[PDB]
Amino acid sequence: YPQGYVPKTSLSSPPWQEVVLPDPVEETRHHAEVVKRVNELIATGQYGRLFAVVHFASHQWKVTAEDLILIENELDIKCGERIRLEKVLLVGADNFTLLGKPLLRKELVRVEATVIEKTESWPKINMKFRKRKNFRKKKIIVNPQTILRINTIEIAPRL
Amino acid sequence: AGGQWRLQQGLAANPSGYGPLTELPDWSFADGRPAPPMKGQLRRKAQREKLARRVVLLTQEMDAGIQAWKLRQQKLQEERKKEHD
Amino acid sequence: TYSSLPDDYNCQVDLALTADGRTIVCYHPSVDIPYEHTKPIPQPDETHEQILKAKLEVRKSKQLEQGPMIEQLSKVFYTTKHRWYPHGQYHNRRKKLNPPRDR
Amino acid sequence: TDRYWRVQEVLKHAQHFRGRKNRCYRLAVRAVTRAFVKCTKARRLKKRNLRTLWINRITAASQEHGLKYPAFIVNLIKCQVELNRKVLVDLAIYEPKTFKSLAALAKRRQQEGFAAALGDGKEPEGIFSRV
Amino acid sequence: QSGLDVIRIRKPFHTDNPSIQGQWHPFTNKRTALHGLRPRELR
Amino acid sequence: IPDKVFQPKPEDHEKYGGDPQNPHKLHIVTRIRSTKRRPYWEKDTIKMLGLQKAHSPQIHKNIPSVNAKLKVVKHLIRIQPLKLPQGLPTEETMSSTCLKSTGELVVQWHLKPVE
RNA sequence: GUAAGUUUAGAUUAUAGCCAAAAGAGGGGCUCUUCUGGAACGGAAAAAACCUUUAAUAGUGAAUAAUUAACAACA
């Protein structure tokens, strides 16, 4: 028996099974090959509806055409004016998707939406838990609000 | 989660901390007009500017704090070596 | 065989990083079921209501009694008898008449 | 002379109560304050409950592909992926093909992470482990 | 403001195309068998 | 507290990578605990140091008076030496300063990923 | 390091704790005296008194704190 030989048993081998990654040099060629084919797919425009993840305010919104998003604050923009969202981290197609690291280049993706309405919120109770609470010890919030309608998503083969 | 790994790479432990994602503007006009600076970003910017001025002032005061010691030693040194007539 | 996960069930997954490294490229074309791995539609020879009538056959004492009727209903749907019992007028009126529907 | 309107103010909030409470001002007033207090507290707890639901759904989706929830999250962070938990649920529900692609990416990073530990750091960073 | 009523909104999102890649169903990720043999089928 | 705690050893210098000469000038301190249920002297020291809010960066000098005050609250703070790879900021660059978690204060923020 | 302090004039209110944890003194568990801390919406099972917790605001965000458990003897 060769040196450093251990017969296989319940405790001799780890429960996990080792795996072997492909060699880097050929692996990069596949990475380049995948990009070239996908670049042709983008050039051919072989996609219909698309979904994109856009971060606005303090929240991340997964977005698609015709989507309506509500932001609970003023934006200083008149209604009916198209605006461009500048924070997109993910865009998807029927048979392919693109992921930012952590964001895509501005050239690749352009997203535009329009302001629909500026409003406030319905009353929100703010009662307090104090001995002898009383019936006239409460507050209302009615925070401001705004409405946005997604308009278009634009991409180009700029890989 | 993941704060420890982010610190190892030198980034902020919380993704919501110091980073282009939070700092950069979140939108721009379709016409191309730049969006107004964010109120939160401006408020955060002001604090950093105030701290920077304090840091420079402290170091300037610190430089004198040690440099002056050398000027008081020169006065002590010259005082020891004295003569007349 | 670059993909680290089996591609034979949902779709072929090809994960690639762009040369610049600023983007991650994923190609996910769907995979169809092989013909040889499927069975033909039953050659020997339909509304769900028809099955319900056959399942809830009227056999004993013409229409069955309330208790047995619930038991037959409970057995078919693997539910408890308590669900089938009616409720009083007070709760019935409370139900909202026109719940909102969007899209 | 307007005590009736004061009663109506309590009544409008107590019309949906049950028993003599809904019709007795002495009891109706007390219930309304308690109901308002309950709603105020529930606002904070509502957000926490939603996060718990999102985590559970992600685990089921991850377990469907054979990946544990902690492993998936850590690999995504190591990959500079900053999707929030709520969005992760949405991707699985409506983009299963994309979610499977995400699962492979996380699995590859975990495999690279295991390889890096076995390598002991002598080997260079992996293609998917480049930061 | 618009004529729309101002009350609690259950969901801040409205979309007419919830799914693009298809909704998940249990048969997703389930492997097929040759001849579509059901489990335990002698055949 | 005995000075031996603050008397370094050769292994400590290697572990923390700090040269015994050219001591660092500025301290970075953040409060990591509450002063509730703590004695009044501990409460007063925290108030004097200005660390009312937890996880708040503060600029302090590495001087004996500051060192003595920090020692009293040592267990409630994290001390990190401030580094200036690019040196002190100028008036023009005063607005471009940013302190990294590594402890280095850059005088120019280019909004480019370190990667 | 930090921003209050001393004096003059007018003037009341308050003047019964509770529990934890230390140091003493009687008993020999208790009985006292002295010092320190506390009053969650989190946690220790429910838990005024122990632990994590700077105020309070909307959000279908994010990072963390305390956190009921723990793995026979031969030389």
GROMACS .gro file of C-alpha atoms in nm, chain A residues 70-138:
model
   69
   70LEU     CA    1  -4.573   5.505  -0.575
   71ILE     CA    2  -4.317   5.713  -0.385
   72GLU     CA    3  -4.429   5.854  -0.050
   73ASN     CA    4  -4.267   6.196  -0.084
   74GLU     CA    5  -4.248   6.501  -0.307
   75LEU     CA    6  -4.017   6.498  -0.609
   76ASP     CA    7  -4.039   6.861  -0.734
   77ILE     CA    8  -4.129   6.740  -1.086
   78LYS     CA    9  -4.447   6.843  -1.267
   79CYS     CA   10  -4.690   6.570  -1.366
   80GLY     CA   11  -4.668   6.433  -1.718
   81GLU     CA   12  -4.294   6.500  -1.749
   82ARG     CA   13  -4.074   6.208  -1.849
   83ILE     CA   14  -3.776   6.137  -1.623
   84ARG     CA   15  -3.482   5.896  -1.644
   85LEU     CA   16  -3.405   5.659  -1.358
   86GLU     CA   17  -3.027   5.639  -1.326
   87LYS     CA   18  -2.990   5.337  -1.092
   88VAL     CA   19  -3.045   5.005  -1.271
   89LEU     CA   20  -2.866   4.694  -1.145
   90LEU     CA   21  -3.040   4.419  -1.345
   91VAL     CA   22  -3.212   4.388  -1.683
   92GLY     CA   23  -3.366   4.071  -1.820
   93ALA     CA   24  -3.484   3.926  -2.150
   94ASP     CA   25  -3.667   3.610  -2.250
   95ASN     CA   26  -3.351   3.398  -2.287
   96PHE     CA   27  -3.080   3.614  -2.127
   97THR     CA   28  -3.015   3.856  -1.842
   98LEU     CA   29  -2.752   4.115  -1.749
   99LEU     CA   30  -2.624   4.187  -1.397
  100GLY     CA   31  -2.441   4.496  -1.277
  101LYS     CA   32  -2.129   4.477  -1.060
  102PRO     CA   33  -2.298   4.634  -0.874
  103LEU     CA   34  -2.438   4.849  -1.157
  104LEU     CA   35  -2.435   4.839  -1.536
  105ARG     CA   36  -2.270   5.106  -1.748
  106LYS     CA   37  -2.494   5.403  -1.826
  107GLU     CA   38  -2.439   5.350  -2.199
  108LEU     CA   39  -2.585   4.998  -2.198
  109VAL     CA   40  -2.922   5.077  -2.037
  110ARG     CA   41  -3.150   5.381  -2.050
  111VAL     CA   42  -3.479   5.379  -1.857
  112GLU     CA   43  -3.745   5.652  -1.867
  113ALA     CA   44  -4.069   5.704  -1.675
  114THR     CA   45  -4.332   5.976  -1.631
  115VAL     CA   46  -4.483   6.144  -1.325
  116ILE     CA   47  -4.857   6.081  -1.296
  117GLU     CA   48  -4.979   6.237  -0.971
  118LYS     CA   49  -4.866   6.405  -0.650
  119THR     CA   50  -5.079   6.316  -0.348
  120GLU     CA   51  -5.061   6.242   0.024
  121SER     CA   52  -5.143   5.933   0.231
  122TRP     CA   53  -5.460   5.834   0.411
  123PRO     CA   54  -5.471   5.906   0.786
  124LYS     CA   55  -5.239   5.694   1.002
  125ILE     CA   56  -5.324   5.660   1.371
  126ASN     CA   57  -5.045   5.754   1.613
  127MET     CA   58  -5.201   5.692   1.954
  128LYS     CA   59  -4.987   5.661   2.267
  129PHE     CA   60  -4.986   5.402   2.547
  130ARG     CA   61  -4.983   5.615   2.862
  131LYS     CA   62  -5.185   5.561   3.180
  132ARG     CA   63  -5.508   5.758   3.150
  133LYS     CA   64  -5.472   5.745   2.773
  134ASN     CA   65  -5.766   5.982   2.719
  135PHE     CA   66  -5.972   6.006   2.399
  136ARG     CA   67  -5.797   6.322   2.272
  137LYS     CA   68  -5.437   6.193   2.275
  138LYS     CA   69  -5.346   6.083   1.922
   0.00000   0.00000   0.00000
